[PDB]
């Protein structure tokens, strides 16, 4: 019943983590991560939050990260678990069938492949990561979400290119299929699932975007809905109590954002809520 904002960057790569209580409309800092991570992916599995990859630009930092750490809310502690096969900043993360998927990203390590189409899956029982079928398109700054048993990879950027394309992963056949593209190209896009639709929130069309669009899987179509009050690239989203929360990001035309706003799908309206303690772009967000 809380939103967790994990890491990010402030105009400083962050290890701090703060939690939003909707009943009190307040953010409280909790235990910080072991590692500073901007462009981090976050997922929730079995009562724990996983922070996956990211970028540690601190002076003794490792830069593009393959490391992964898990938050236990009962002990208020983070523990490092097995690292991914590939370093990934700007990575998308989803949970499906008891496994965590790390999708795309950017490997800027020496000998790295730069923009990634690869995808790997974490088994918490064995503490191991395995590469699965790659996407059709390389996508850094990609958004992901799970709808009807499939993982959707939305937007991102590739080398040459900000993407409007979208593809869906079927875990049974281990394959990725392009579906309808978005109306707008979006990298650094937030993606969440609410009421049977995927929402693509904000991002960057290389314009920092306030626009929001919704995907109907029945018709394979994207439609714009009400725009956010603030333009946000590198935004985190999550769903709590029937609303989408857009958390932080960057408005490149007040820069790094601590503001937060919430979308009501019934009324098609965005409303600001309490801002975070820290400004965070490239922030990971999950609900636990």
PDB file of N, CA, C and O in Angstrom, residues 59-126:
ATOM      1  N   UNK A  59      32.013   9.293  -7.822  1.00  0.00           N
ATOM      2  CA  UNK A  59      33.435   9.289  -8.223  1.00  0.00           C
ATOM      3  C   UNK A  59      34.159   7.929  -8.145  1.00  0.00           C
ATOM      4  O   UNK A  59      35.022   7.738  -8.989  1.00  0.00           O
ATOM      5  N   UNK A  60      33.845   7.046  -7.194  1.00  0.00           N
ATOM      6  CA  UNK A  60      34.399   5.670  -7.125  1.00  0.00           C
ATOM      7  C   UNK A  60      33.371   4.704  -7.712  1.00  0.00           C
ATOM      8  O   UNK A  60      33.538   3.502  -7.498  1.00  0.00           O
ATOM      9  N   UNK A  61      32.362   5.194  -8.448  1.00  0.00           N
ATOM     10  CA  UNK A  61      31.301   4.340  -8.932  1.00  0.00           C
ATOM     11  C   UNK A  61      31.716   3.459 -10.093  1.00  0.00           C
ATOM     12  O   UNK A  61      32.679   3.725 -10.811  1.00  0.00           O
ATOM     13  N   UNK A  62      30.934   2.379 -10.325  1.00  0.00           N
ATOM     14  CA  UNK A  62      31.171   1.328 -11.349  1.00  0.00           C
ATOM     15  C   UNK A  62      30.521   1.685 -12.690  1.00  0.00           C
ATOM     16  O   UNK A  62      30.690   0.928 -13.642  1.00  0.00           O
ATOM     17  N   UNK A  63      29.851   2.827 -12.777  1.00  0.00           N
ATOM     18  CA  UNK A  63      29.175   3.267 -14.022  1.00  0.00           C
ATOM     19  C   UNK A  63      28.015   2.313 -14.322  1.00  0.00           C
ATOM     20  O   UNK A  63      27.205   2.167 -13.468  1.00  0.00           O
ATOM     21  N   UNK A  64      27.939   1.698 -15.491  1.00  0.00           N
ATOM     22  CA  UNK A  64      26.755   0.887 -15.876  1.00  0.00           C
ATOM     23  C   UNK A  64      26.755  -0.348 -14.995  1.00  0.00           C
ATOM     24  O   UNK A  64      27.740  -0.995 -15.034  1.00  0.00           O
ATOM     25  N   UNK A  65      25.653  -0.678 -14.352  1.00  0.00           N
ATOM     26  CA  UNK A  65      25.603  -1.716 -13.337  1.00  0.00           C
ATOM     27  C   UNK A  65      24.936  -2.994 -13.829  1.00  0.00           C
ATOM     28  O   UNK A  65      23.875  -2.954 -14.466  1.00  0.00           O
ATOM     29  N   UNK A  66      25.561  -4.138 -13.505  1.00  0.00           N
ATOM     30  CA  UNK A  66      24.862  -5.410 -13.543  1.00  0.00           C
ATOM     31  C   UNK A  66      24.365  -5.853 -12.178  1.00  0.00           C
ATOM     32  O   UNK A  66      23.654  -6.852 -12.092  1.00  0.00           O
ATOM     33  N   UNK A  67      24.666  -5.108 -11.117  1.00  0.00           N
ATOM     34  CA  UNK A  67      24.277  -5.583  -9.808  1.00  0.00           C
ATOM     35  C   UNK A  67      22.791  -5.371  -9.540  1.00  0.00           C
ATOM     36  O   UNK A  67      22.097  -4.570 -10.193  1.00  0.00           O
ATOM     37  N   UNK A  68      22.320  -6.125  -8.557  1.00  0.00           N
ATOM     38  CA  UNK A  68      20.910  -6.239  -8.216  1.00  0.00           C
ATOM     39  C   UNK A  68      20.827  -6.327  -6.692  1.00  0.00           C
ATOM     40  O   UNK A  68      21.594  -7.089  -6.078  1.00  0.00           O
ATOM     41  N   UNK A  69      19.934  -5.565  -6.077  1.00  0.00           N
ATOM     42  CA  UNK A  69      19.757  -5.680  -4.605  1.00  0.00           C
ATOM     43  C   UNK A  69      18.274  -5.740  -4.253  1.00  0.00           C
ATOM     44  O   UNK A  69      17.486  -5.282  -4.990  1.00  0.00           O
ATOM     45  N   UNK A  70      17.970  -6.324  -3.112  1.00  0.00           N
ATOM     46  CA  UNK A  70      16.584  -6.626  -2.705  1.00  0.00           C
ATOM     47  C   UNK A  70      16.280  -5.964  -1.366  1.00  0.00           C
ATOM     48  O   UNK A  70      17.039  -6.128  -0.450  1.00  0.00           O
ATOM     49  N   UNK A  71      15.139  -5.319  -1.268  1.00  0.00           N
ATOM     50  CA  UNK A  71      14.708  -4.624  -0.045  1.00  0.00           C
ATOM     51  C   UNK A  71      13.715  -5.458   0.703  1.00  0.00           C
ATOM     52  O   UNK A  71      12.723  -5.888   0.122  1.00  0.00           O
ATOM     53  N   UNK A  72      13.997  -5.704   1.976  1.00  0.00           N
ATOM     54  CA  UNK A  72      13.063  -6.334   2.889  1.00  0.00           C
ATOM     55  C   UNK A  72      12.397  -5.273   3.741  1.00  0.00           C
ATOM     56  O   UNK A  72      13.068  -4.670   4.589  1.00  0.00           O
ATOM     57  N   UNK A  73      11.095  -5.011   3.565  1.00  0.00           N
ATOM     58  CA  UNK A  73      10.457  -3.940   4.339  1.00  0.00           C
ATOM     59  C   UNK A  73      10.354  -4.240   5.817  1.00  0.00           C
ATOM     60  O   UNK A  73      10.237  -3.308   6.616  1.00  0.00           O
ATOM     61  N   UNK A  74      10.398  -5.500   6.206  1.00  0.00           N
ATOM     62  CA  UNK A  74      10.232  -5.872   7.632  1.00  0.00           C
ATOM     63  C   UNK A  74      11.505  -5.495   8.380  1.00  0.00           C
ATOM     64  O   UNK A  74      11.404  -4.935   9.481  1.00  0.00           O
ATOM     65  N   UNK A  75      12.656  -5.754   7.795  1.00  0.00           N
ATOM     66  CA  UNK A  75      13.969  -5.449   8.417  1.00  0.00           C
ATOM     67  C   UNK A  75      14.463  -4.065   7.999  1.00  0.00           C
ATOM     68  O   UNK A  75      15.418  -3.590   8.592  1.00  0.00           O
ATOM     69  N   UNK A  76      13.841  -3.468   6.980  1.00  0.00           N
ATOM     70  CA  UNK A  76      14.265  -2.150   6.447  1.00  0.00           C
ATOM     71  C   UNK A  76      15.733  -2.263   6.046  1.00  0.00           C
ATOM     72  O   UNK A  76      16.540  -1.481   6.529  1.00  0.00           O
ATOM     73  N   UNK A  77      16.051  -3.200   5.146  1.00  0.00           N
ATOM     74  CA  UNK A  77      17.416  -3.485   4.762  1.00  0.00           C
ATOM     75  C   UNK A  77      17.473  -3.895   3.301  1.00  0.00           C
ATOM     76  O   UNK A  77      16.557  -4.557   2.802  1.00  0.00           O
ATOM     77  N   UNK A  78      18.591  -3.559   2.648  1.00  0.00           N
ATOM     78  CA  UNK A  78      18.861  -3.946   1.259  1.00  0.00           C
ATOM     79  C   UNK A  78      20.012  -4.934   1.233  1.00  0.00           C
ATOM     80  O   UNK A  78      21.044  -4.695   1.857  1.00  0.00           O
ATOM     81  N   UNK A  79      19.858  -6.004   0.454  1.00  0.00           N
ATOM     82  CA  UNK A  79      20.909  -7.007   0.302  1.00  0.00           C
ATOM     83  C   UNK A  79      21.182  -7.262  -1.179  1.00  0.00           C
ATOM     84  O   UNK A  79      20.257  -7.432  -1.983  1.00  0.00           O
ATOM     85  N   UNK A  80      22.455  -7.315  -1.535  1.00  0.00           N
ATOM     86  CA  UNK A  80      22.838  -7.609  -2.908  1.00  0.00           C
ATOM     87  C   UNK A  80      22.628  -9.086  -3.211  1.00  0.00           C
ATOM     88  O   UNK A  80      22.981  -9.950  -2.403  1.00  0.00           O
ATOM     89  N   UNK A  81      22.074  -9.376  -4.386  1.00  0.00           N
ATOM     90  CA  UNK A  81      21.829 -10.749  -4.836  1.00  0.00           C
ATOM     91  C   UNK A  81      22.658 -11.004  -6.103  1.00  0.00           C
ATOM     92  O   UNK A  81      23.612 -10.268  -6.384  1.00  0.00           O
ATOM     93  N   UNK A  82      22.345 -12.043  -6.874  1.00  0.00           N
ATOM     94  CA  UNK A  82      23.193 -12.325  -8.027  1.00  0.00           C
ATOM     95  C   UNK A  82      23.095 -11.211  -9.077  1.00  0.00           C
ATOM     96  O   UNK A  82      21.991 -10.716  -9.367  1.00  0.00           O
ATOM     97  N   UNK A  83      24.214 -10.832  -9.689  1.00  0.00           N
ATOM     98  CA  UNK A  83      24.180  -9.828 -10.754  1.00  0.00           C
ATOM     99  C   UNK A  83      23.675 -10.410 -12.070  1.00  0.00           C
ATOM    100  O   UNK A  83      23.761 -11.610 -12.321  1.00  0.00           O
ATOM    101  N   UNK A  84      23.180  -9.524 -12.938  1.00  0.00           N
ATOM    102  CA  UNK A  84      22.757  -9.914 -14.286  1.00  0.00           C
ATOM    103  C   UNK A  84      23.944 -10.340 -15.139  1.00  0.00           C
ATOM    104  O   UNK A  84      25.097 -10.019 -14.844  1.00  0.00           O
ATOM    105  N   UNK A  85      23.622 -11.044 -16.226  1.00  0.00           N
ATOM    106  CA  UNK A  85      24.599 -11.375 -17.263  1.00  0.00           C
ATOM    107  C   UNK A  85      25.167 -10.123 -17.907  1.00  0.00           C
ATOM    108  O   UNK A  85      26.348 -10.092 -18.274  1.00  0.00           O
ATOM    109  N   UNK A  86      24.335  -9.086 -18.075  1.00  0.00           N
ATOM    110  CA  UNK A  86      24.716  -7.889 -18.817  1.00  0.00           C
ATOM    111  C   UNK A  86      24.466  -6.663 -17.950  1.00  0.00           C
ATOM    112  O   UNK A  86      23.460  -6.577 -17.252  1.00  0.00           O
ATOM    113  N   UNK A  87      25.419  -5.720 -17.967  1.00  0.00           N
ATOM    114  CA  UNK A  87      25.215  -4.415 -17.348  1.00  0.00           C
ATOM    115  C   UNK A  87      24.147  -3.647 -18.113  1.00  0.00           C
ATOM    116  O   UNK A  87      24.139  -3.634 -19.346  1.00  0.00           O
ATOM    117  N   UNK A  88      23.247  -2.998 -17.381  1.00  0.00           N
ATOM    118  CA  UNK A  88      22.090  -2.352 -18.001  1.00  0.00           C
ATOM    119  C   UNK A  88      21.717  -1.102 -17.210  1.00  0.00           C
ATOM    120  O   UNK A  88      21.165  -1.218 -16.119  1.00  0.00           O
ATOM    121  N   UNK A  89      21.961   0.081 -17.763  1.00  0.00           N
ATOM    122  CA  UNK A  89      21.325   1.291 -17.278  1.00  0.00           C
ATOM    123  C   UNK A  89      20.160   1.637 -18.198  1.00  0.00           C
ATOM    124  O   UNK A  89      20.098   1.205 -19.333  1.00  0.00           O
ATOM    125  N   UNK A  90      19.203   2.391 -17.683  1.00  0.00           N
ATOM    126  CA  UNK A  90      18.018   2.682 -18.481  1.00  0.00           C
ATOM    127  C   UNK A  90      17.243   1.430 -18.825  1.00  0.00           C
ATOM    128  O   UNK A  90      16.695   1.322 -19.934  1.00  0.00           O
ATOM    129  N   UNK A  91      17.201   0.499 -17.910  1.00  0.00           N
ATOM    130  CA  UNK A  91      16.625  -0.829 -18.070  1.00  0.00           C
ATOM    131  C   UNK A  91      15.172  -0.837 -17.638  1.00  0.00           C
ATOM    132  O   UNK A  91      14.782  -0.132 -16.724  1.00  0.00           O
ATOM    133  N   UNK A  92      14.356  -1.632 -18.320  1.00  0.00           N
ATOM    134  CA  UNK A  92      12.992  -1.891 -17.907  1.00  0.00           C
ATOM    135  C   UNK A  92      12.920  -3.207 -17.153  1.00  0.00           C
ATOM    136  O   UNK A  92      13.585  -4.171 -17.516  1.00  0.00           O
ATOM    137  N   UNK A  93      12.073  -3.264 -16.142  1.00  0.00           N
ATOM    138  CA  UNK A  93      11.943  -4.455 -15.305  1.00  0.00           C
ATOM    139  C   UNK A  93      10.476  -4.797 -15.116  1.00  0.00           C
ATOM    140  O   UNK A  93       9.668  -3.910 -14.823  1.00  0.00           O
ATOM    141  N   UNK A  94      10.153  -6.086 -15.234  1.00  0.00           N
ATOM    142  CA  UNK A  94       8.804  -6.583 -15.037  1.00  0.00           C
ATOM    143  C   UNK A  94       8.855  -7.878 -14.259  1.00  0.00           C
ATOM    144  O   UNK A  94       9.834  -8.593 -14.316  1.00  0.00           O
ATOM    145  N   UNK A  95       7.758  -8.206 -13.591  1.00  0.00           N
ATOM    146  CA  UNK A  95       7.617  -9.457 -12.870  1.00  0.00           C
ATOM    147  C   UNK A  95       6.513 -10.244 -13.540  1.00  0.00           C
ATOM    148  O   UNK A  95       5.428  -9.710 -13.783  1.00  0.00           O
ATOM    149  N   UNK A  96       6.780 -11.505 -13.804  1.00  0.00           N
ATOM    150  CA  UNK A  96       5.839 -12.377 -14.488  1.00  0.00           C
ATOM    151  C   UNK A  96       6.132 -13.806 -14.066  1.00  0.00           C
ATOM    152  O   UNK A  96       7.270 -14.272 -14.172  1.00  0.00           O
ATOM    153  N   UNK A  97       5.097 -14.489 -13.586  1.00  0.00           N
ATOM    154  CA  UNK A  97       5.185 -15.895 -13.211  1.00  0.00           C
ATOM    155  C   UNK A  97       6.322 -16.158 -12.215  1.00  0.00           C
ATOM    156  O   UNK A  97       7.054 -17.132 -12.339  1.00  0.00           O
ATOM    157  N   UNK A  98       6.476 -15.295 -11.216  1.00  0.00           N
ATOM    158  CA  UNK A  98       7.487 -15.521 -10.194  1.00  0.00           C
ATOM    159  C   UNK A  98       8.920 -15.242 -10.590  1.00  0.00           C
ATOM    160  O   UNK A  98       9.828 -15.581  -9.823  1.00  0.00           O
ATOM    161  N   UNK A  99       9.155 -14.635 -11.747  1.00  0.00           N
ATOM    162  CA  UNK A  99      10.494 -14.283 -12.195  1.00  0.00           C
ATOM    163  C   UNK A  99      10.552 -12.798 -12.486  1.00  0.00           C
ATOM    164  O   UNK A  99       9.542 -12.182 -12.841  1.00  0.00           O
ATOM    165  N   UNK A 100      11.744 -12.225 -12.363  1.00  0.00           N
ATOM    166  CA  UNK A 100      11.969 -10.828 -12.720  1.00  0.00           C
ATOM    167  C   UNK A 100      12.635 -10.795 -14.078  1.00  0.00           C
ATOM    168  O   UNK A 100      13.639 -11.465 -14.286  1.00  0.00           O
ATOM    169  N   UNK A 101      12.116  -9.986 -14.987  1.00  0.00           N
ATOM    170  CA  UNK A 101      12.700  -9.813 -16.305  1.00  0.00           C
ATOM    171  C   UNK A 101      13.355  -8.443 -16.364  1.00  0.00           C
ATOM    172  O   UNK A 101      12.722  -7.434 -16.046  1.00  0.00           O
ATOM    173  N   UNK A 102      14.591  -8.412 -16.833  1.00  0.00           N
ATOM    174  CA  UNK A 102      15.315  -7.200 -17.165  1.00  0.00           C
ATOM    175  C   UNK A 102      15.364  -7.098 -18.676  1.00  0.00           C
ATOM    176  O   UNK A 102      15.836  -8.013 -19.351  1.00  0.00           O
ATOM    177  N   UNK A 103      14.861  -5.983 -19.189  1.00  0.00           N
ATOM    178  CA  UNK A 103      14.572  -5.794 -20.593  1.00  0.00           C
ATOM    179  C   UNK A 103      15.383  -4.622 -21.118  1.00  0.00           C
ATOM    180  O   UNK A 103      15.222  -3.485 -20.658  1.00  0.00           O
ATOM    181  N   UNK A 104      16.201  -4.872 -22.134  1.00  0.00           N
ATOM    182  CA  UNK A 104      16.877  -3.772 -22.790  1.00  0.00           C
ATOM    183  C   UNK A 104      17.820  -3.042 -21.871  1.00  0.00           C
ATOM    184  O   UNK A 104      18.457  -3.621 -20.975  1.00  0.00           O
ATOM    185  N   UNK A 105      17.953  -1.752 -22.128  1.00  0.00           N
ATOM    186  CA  UNK A 105      18.885  -0.922 -21.426  1.00  0.00           C
ATOM    187  C   UNK A 105      20.075  -0.545 -22.274  1.00  0.00           C
ATOM    188  O   UNK A 105      20.074  -0.669 -23.504  1.00  0.00           O
ATOM    189  N   UNK A 106      21.132  -0.116 -21.592  1.00  0.00           N
ATOM    190  CA  UNK A 106      22.346   0.361 -22.229  1.00  0.00           C
ATOM    191  C   UNK A 106      23.535  -0.182 -21.462  1.00  0.00           C
ATOM    192  O   UNK A 106      23.591  -0.066 -20.236  1.00  0.00           O
ATOM    193  N   UNK A 107      24.439  -0.817 -22.183  1.00  0.00           N
ATOM    194  CA  UNK A 107      25.687  -1.307 -21.625  1.00  0.00           C
ATOM    195  C   UNK A 107      26.810  -0.432 -22.162  1.00  0.00           C
ATOM    196  O   UNK A 107      27.298  -0.657 -23.271  1.00  0.00           O
ATOM    197  N   UNK A 108      27.235   0.547 -21.379  1.00  0.00           N
ATOM    198  CA  UNK A 108      28.298   1.492 -21.758  1.00  0.00           C
ATOM    199  C   UNK A 108      29.615   1.086 -21.148  1.00  0.00           C
ATOM    200  O   UNK A 108      30.498   1.934 -21.072  1.00  0.00           O
ATOM    201  N   UNK A 109      29.725  -0.154 -20.682  1.00  0.00           N
ATOM    202  CA  UNK A 109      30.979  -0.706 -20.124  1.00  0.00           C
ATOM    203  C   UNK A 109      31.971  -0.818 -21.278  1.00  0.00           C
ATOM    204  O   UNK A 109      31.546  -0.633 -22.411  1.00  0.00           O
ATOM    205  N   UNK A 110      33.279  -1.049 -21.035  1.00  0.00           N
ATOM    206  CA  UNK A 110      34.220  -1.267 -22.135  1.00  0.00           C
ATOM    207  C   UNK A 110      33.907  -2.646 -22.734  1.00  0.00           C
ATOM    208  O   UNK A 110      33.684  -3.545 -21.970  1.00  0.00           O
ATOM    209  N   UNK A 111      33.820  -2.760 -24.056  1.00  0.00           N
ATOM    210  CA  UNK A 111      33.395  -3.968 -24.758  1.00  0.00           C
ATOM    211  C   UNK A 111      31.882  -4.133 -24.678  1.00  0.00           C
ATOM    212  O   UNK A 111      31.358  -5.179 -25.096  1.00  0.00           O
ATOM    213  N   UNK A 112      31.160  -3.141 -24.149  1.00  0.00           N
ATOM    214  CA  UNK A 112      29.717  -3.229 -24.086  1.00  0.00           C
ATOM    215  C   UNK A 112      29.069  -3.066 -25.447  1.00  0.00           C
ATOM    216  O   UNK A 112      29.630  -2.485 -26.374  1.00  0.00           O
ATOM    217  N   UNK A 113      27.842  -3.589 -25.594  1.00  0.00           N
ATOM    218  CA  UNK A 113      27.084  -3.576 -26.871  1.00  0.00           C
ATOM    219  C   UNK A 113      26.279  -2.284 -27.025  1.00  0.00           C
ATOM    220  O   UNK A 113      25.597  -2.179 -28.033  1.00  0.00           O
ATOM    221  N   UNK A 114      26.379  -1.350 -26.083  1.00  0.00           N
ATOM    222  CA  UNK A 114      25.624  -0.067 -26.090  1.00  0.00           C
ATOM    223  C   UNK A 114      24.120  -0.380 -26.021  1.00  0.00           C
ATOM    224  O   UNK A 114      23.733  -1.037 -25.094  1.00  0.00           O
ATOM    225  N   UNK A 115      23.298  -0.007 -26.984  1.00  0.00           N
ATOM    226  CA  UNK A 115      21.827  -0.157 -26.826  1.00  0.00           C
ATOM    227  C   UNK A 115      21.494  -1.636 -26.863  1.00  0.00           C
ATOM    228  O   UNK A 115      21.996  -2.224 -27.769  1.00  0.00           O
ATOM    229  N   UNK A 116      20.677  -2.170 -25.951  1.00  0.00           N
ATOM    230  CA  UNK A 116      20.434  -3.602 -25.829  1.00  0.00           C
ATOM    231  C   UNK A 116      19.062  -4.017 -26.342  1.00  0.00           C
ATOM    232  O   UNK A 116      18.057  -3.390 -26.009  1.00  0.00           O
ATOM    233  N   UNK A 117      19.024  -5.139 -27.094  1.00  0.00           N
ATOM    234  CA  UNK A 117      17.779  -5.853 -27.344  1.00  0.00           C
ATOM    235  C   UNK A 117      17.656  -7.086 -26.465  1.00  0.00           C
ATOM    236  O   UNK A 117      16.604  -7.724 -26.448  1.00  0.00           O
ATOM    237  N   UNK A 118      18.676  -7.393 -25.671  1.00  0.00           N
ATOM    238  CA  UNK A 118      18.597  -8.633 -24.913  1.00  0.00           C
ATOM    239  C   UNK A 118      17.705  -8.483 -23.686  1.00  0.00           C
ATOM    240  O   UNK A 118      17.428  -7.370 -23.198  1.00  0.00           O
ATOM    241  N   UNK A 119      17.308  -9.643 -23.168  1.00  0.00           N
ATOM    242  CA  UNK A 119      16.334  -9.785 -22.097  1.00  0.00           C
ATOM    243  C   UNK A 119      16.790 -10.942 -21.240  1.00  0.00           C
ATOM    244  O   UNK A 119      17.171 -11.989 -21.777  1.00  0.00           O
ATOM    245  N   UNK A 120      16.775 -10.771 -19.920  1.00  0.00           N
ATOM    246  CA  UNK A 120      17.158 -11.860 -19.031  1.00  0.00           C
ATOM    247  C   UNK A 120      16.186 -11.948 -17.872  1.00  0.00           C
ATOM    248  O   UNK A 120      15.518 -10.969 -17.516  1.00  0.00           O
ATOM    249  N   UNK A 121      16.093 -13.141 -17.304  1.00  0.00           N
ATOM    250  CA  UNK A 121      15.104 -13.504 -16.307  1.00  0.00           C
ATOM    251  C   UNK A 121      15.789 -14.030 -15.052  1.00  0.00           C
ATOM    252  O   UNK A 121      16.681 -14.886 -15.134  1.00  0.00           O
ATOM    253  N   UNK A 122      15.339 -13.538 -13.902  1.00  0.00           N
ATOM    254  CA  UNK A 122      15.871 -13.894 -12.601  1.00  0.00           C
ATOM    255  C   UNK A 122      14.951 -14.874 -11.918  1.00  0.00           C
ATOM    256  O   UNK A 122      13.752 -14.616 -11.785  1.00  0.00           O
ATOM    257  N   UNK A 123      15.552 -15.969 -11.434  1.00  0.00           N
ATOM    258  CA  UNK A 123      14.878 -16.980 -10.644  1.00  0.00           C
ATOM    259  C   UNK A 123      15.287 -16.771  -9.195  1.00  0.00           C
ATOM    260  O   UNK A 123      16.455 -17.026  -8.840  1.00  0.00           O
ATOM    261  N   UNK A 124      14.406 -16.264  -8.311  1.00  0.00           N
ATOM    262  CA  UNK A 124      14.792 -15.978  -6.933  1.00  0.00           C
ATOM    263  C   UNK A 124      15.121 -17.250  -6.133  1.00  0.00           C
ATOM    264  O   UNK A 124      15.869 -17.181  -5.219  1.00  0.00           O
ATOM    265  N   UNK A 125      14.576 -18.387  -6.528  1.00  0.00           N
ATOM    266  CA  UNK A 125      14.808 -19.657  -5.788  1.00  0.00           C
ATOM    267  C   UNK A 125      16.270 -20.073  -5.979  1.00  0.00           C
ATOM    268  O   UNK A 125      16.880 -20.470  -4.991  1.00  0.00           O
ATOM    269  N   UNK A 126      16.808 -19.965  -7.189  1.00  0.00           N
ATOM    270  CA  UNK A 126      18.199 -20.381  -7.506  1.00  0.00           C
ATOM    271  C   UNK A 126      19.159 -19.189  -7.430  1.00  0.00           C
ATOM    272  O   UNK A 126      20.360 -19.418  -7.468  1.00  0.00           O
TER     273      UNK A 126
END
